[PDB]
Symmetry: C3
Subunit: 448 residues, 3 copies
């Protein structure tokens, strides 16, 4: 299942065995809350029950006023992470919102949700959206509160009506609160925006495959984090916002994680040493004949052995980029490195073990809870599997290794940094490539 290879020659390790789930699409549903047009009334009733009702009705009216004032606002430019392109993530969402502002378009929805709280409506721009009514405050305030306020004055008050209205009104107040401190766009989508039972019901009614229905349902928390809640409009007794859900159009393709660490010579004199680091670390997933590379592997969520990623955070590379692992000098692909005198010690915890880059006088060991040091690392880049090992210590820093099971393969090889004459080594390329470095080396070697 999940296995791992360490390449001694380049101080890198690849964890493989993973399966992809890459977001490639967006499903945009419209969540609605039916509001009520209430004008406050001349009501002379001291009784504290009525007073509490009116205090809650003010909360309601202020939440609406706040959301309206907010909807004047309607709703960028961001180791190889700078290489990423730039795009807006809520774009299909904002697209749907702009349609909802068209005259007559809100009326279309409330008519669909007149006899049911869940329906599929066709918008004038021709997208079919699932529409939910999740909270009907309209008829509640009208057929529960409104008569008490008006008919025969405030005399007929009931404490269970006070408590019930607090409960009903609360979701509106928390919806508003979230939107107010996020300028109208929310992520992850909270359970206020969409409850667990609602989200699941949404997924079951989507135009997605029976396969995808199962996948999204068994990972709702990941779905929430990759979803957006976009405040859209308040119009004609209706509050509406778009919940924008991830479609995973790439599933169960092979994924592997590349871990890299600095590779340095370990000469007696520590200021005559040269270093080299593979710069292409992160997640890789086979995808439509090419490879999707995610430079900031912190953007992918890993569940078991499935990797949930957003394709907006990837570069698309030739599949030949994998040859950098097995042969960094290959002719098919120019493998990326930096040459920056990073002779500082560190560890990188991998899926099934740990890479240790130990230099200078740093203490670098791997331990077991009950048995003490079982491996001492020497100067250089090395590796230990998580089998029998609990912690890794480099200097004053303690790392815990993952204890998930899997096979590790130590691929012995000569550290490639040894192939270079320190006197002509391009000693500071922040972002270079193997052949690029070889080029400059010869260029200065010609000066003889």
């Amino acid at each position: 299942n999940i296995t791992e290879e360490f390449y001694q020659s380049t101080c890198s390790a690849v964890s493989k065995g993973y399966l992809s789930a890459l977001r490639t699409g967006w499903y945009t549903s419209v969540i609605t809350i039916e509001l009520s047009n209430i004008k406050e009334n001349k009501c002379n009733g001291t009784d504290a029950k009525v007073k509490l009702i009116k205090q809650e009705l003010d909360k309601y009216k202020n939440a609406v006023t706040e959301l309206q004032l907010l909807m004047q606002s309607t709703p960028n430019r961001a180791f190889l992470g700078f290489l990423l392109g730039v795009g807006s993530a809520i774009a299909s969402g904002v697209a749907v919102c702009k349609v909802l502002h068209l005259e007559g378009e809100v009326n279309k929805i409330k008519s669909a949700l007149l006899s049911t709280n869940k329906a599929v409506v066709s918008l004038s721009n021709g997208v079919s959206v699932l529409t939910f009514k999740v909270l009907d405050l309209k008829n509640y305030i009208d057929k529960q509160l409104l008569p008490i306020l008006n008919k025969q004055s405030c005399s007929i008050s009931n404490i269970e009506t006070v408590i019930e209205f607090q409960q009903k009104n609360n979701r509106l107040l928390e919806i508003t609160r979230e939107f107010s401190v996020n300028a109208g766009v929310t992520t992850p989508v909270s359970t206020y925006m969409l409850t667990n039972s609602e989200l699941l019901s949404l997924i079951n009614d989507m135009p997605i495959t029976n396969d995808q229905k199962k996948l999204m349902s068994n990972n709702v928390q990941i779905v929430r984090q990759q979803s957006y809640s976009i405040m859209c409009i308040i119009k004609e007794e209706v509050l509406a916002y778009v919940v924008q859900l991830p479609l995973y159009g790439v599933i169960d393709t092979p994924c592997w994680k590349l871990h890299t660490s600095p590779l340095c010579t370990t000469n007696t004199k520590e200021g005559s040493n040269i270093c080299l680091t593979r710069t292409d670390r992160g997640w890789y997933c086979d995808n439509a004949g090419s490879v999707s590379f995610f430079p900031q592997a912190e953007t992918c969520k890993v569940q078991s052995n499935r990797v949930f990623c957003d394709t907006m955070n990837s570069l698309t590379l030739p599949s030949e980029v994998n040859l950098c692992n097995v042969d960094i000098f290959n002719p098919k692909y120019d493998c990326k490195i930096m040459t920056s005198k990073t002779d500082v010690s560190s560890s990188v915890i991998t899926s099934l073990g740990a890479i240790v880059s130990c230099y200078g006088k740093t203490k670098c060991t791997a331990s077991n809870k009950n048995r003490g040091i079982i491996k001492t690392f020497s100067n250089g880049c090395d590796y230990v599997s998580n089998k029998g090992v609990d912690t890794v210590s480099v200097g004053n820093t303690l790392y815990y290794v993952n204890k998930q099971e899997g096979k590790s393969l130590y691929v012995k090889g000569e550290p490639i940094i040894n192939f270079y004459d320190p006197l002509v080594f391009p000693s500071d390329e922040f972002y270079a490539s193997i052949s690029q470095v070889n080029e400059k080396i010869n260029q200065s070697l010609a000066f003889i």
Copy 2:
């Protein structure tokens, strides 16, 4: 109104037509909650109403204890973003807090807010601050709860008093909760800290121009995000915190966004290619005879065509920096570039279109929802306006273009990367300048 130019020669695009709103100042108001000095009482009453009261009174007492324990704490060092200076953002706030700790100074405020809940008080350090009393728990617990607890024992309990106290006490509990997980400083300022109606009332009573009053009021959500809430003190039946609001001392000056993307030769052999990227991307705003440059354009909030920015996230540059757009080789300003073999494909969505840097074998197209591919990009850097275009596809990644209307201008020109001999091109300067590169080029050209 909003227009855009693409410069083919340098693979960059400038969106202009924007108007500035740059924070240059801070208004520091003092928000107060009047507390009560209650000692719990020997009260033998089982009745569940009283029990619920005492459970809420414990919540109150614990919120106070927590805030006091917190106020022992009272309240850094952070594409050209590293060039930014370092300063504390809550400094004028902390300044006001330190004054509130002076003996007699808290008493000055509570006296001002004795007959009203909104007043302007002059502090001993000579700053005039607007002061609000937003919650008077003191006289509530004293003249609603305290007698019930003591006088004639617990016999006189009332359920509407239970529910009302939960409501009153809640804001205190949420104020506390926020402060407790943020070490006393909050941003964005929540509606617990300052309600929508309060914030607006604050803005109307400030010593700012009638112009600025309108601007801040019509963008309260942006104001919230650029505001700070600083827990200050609990002293003499008073809880006080400072809400620190942005003053926009630069308004309606021209702003433009610079978008850049990698510019590479597209020779048959893909490992003999050289690249070049303008590194000066981000927001630019005319400001006091110079230009305020914001390197991380993700720090500015754009509302319609107004750009809200904080001047602490800007560098101050000569106005001549704009000449980099129209003539990157000009003598007046040394235009910044990097030369790092970024021959990986990507897109940058702009305000009115899209830049596409297409290299290697990557599929790069622009599509329309209903009509399919309408433009196919060739190897190189190119551009397409958002007119008639819905999406842009580079490799496995899909971008949506903005659909706001505006004029786009394609400025044809020779890609400047073509002017360089690949044999002497300084092939890895992470942060260089045009003339810097020309210098090194000649330096190695002299070796002949």
Copy 3:
């Protein structure tokens, strides 16, 4: 106490006098909520009191279902910050969770918390954990609600029971809500997860020194921010999560902050100027014979003169690294610099003053509130202490200086950038070292 030195020769300043508190360990406690196995009942009672009860009981049942669906999920790869290693921070926590899944292991805990709500239990993996029962919903729903629902139908309803159950059930609902939008791991640990009074009680019962008990208690907010809350399991009427607290195994060692800024020549022609910046800025703490260096000083929390840091965000360096401050050319340590033509003006606010790097035509001054400009900076890198100074202005940006008291020392010296011939200066090393630069200089000087 807190003092500071500015080194004119290298445009850097060191603030010292600080005392360390470095996290080196983790204490993992198990927080438990006792749940109840309730099957809903055939109850024909319209009365609104009962209706509200059943609505709250549904909230309870849905919170449990949600947490269970979440626990299918169970629970990386991240100026010198890239040099940091990579490790999982919740590892000892996840370790404890995996043990709690073992059969019989949950039963061990609930038996310990059968007669008390706080006990120390020994897990089968041999770790002694403090275990809390913080909410006993089991016997509440059973001996308060369950009979009302069943026995003699719904006739016996009581409003104080409605309100009380809302209160009891609320913590569960907020625990769930937090976990649901964070995939099961929370930080900072909220007061829902662990109340202020609970956290403190935990600290008092830990196997830590009387010294450490005092330290953690007087800084609970820092403890919260450096803690993790890990959703673990729902099994046998028990909900359990791990709260993972920082152990500070390094305390009261000397800490100092290094501030650096760009150092450039200021020749008449501004495009013939060379620059140099020390790249080793951030926090430094003596630690076990070496120095713990934190490259992103934004990761350390400073309280008074104590510095709270996590050792996972540090590199371990020789103590000789301090010699870079007093003599950047020393033979013992190769001091790190960049040489990147950063001739853009800026300020860095320090602990007791301000560094100003002023270049070009930028206006750079230091002011006092009431007295105006008291210092004007010239082209170059300079410094001013916070004594008598309120603000610093560089270009269009205004900085506030800290007003804490302490001694500042201006160490005069020749700017080292003056020692270099601009014609052979390696004008763009993003991450180099003094001797590295000297090397390349001679290498190109040999070509004569």
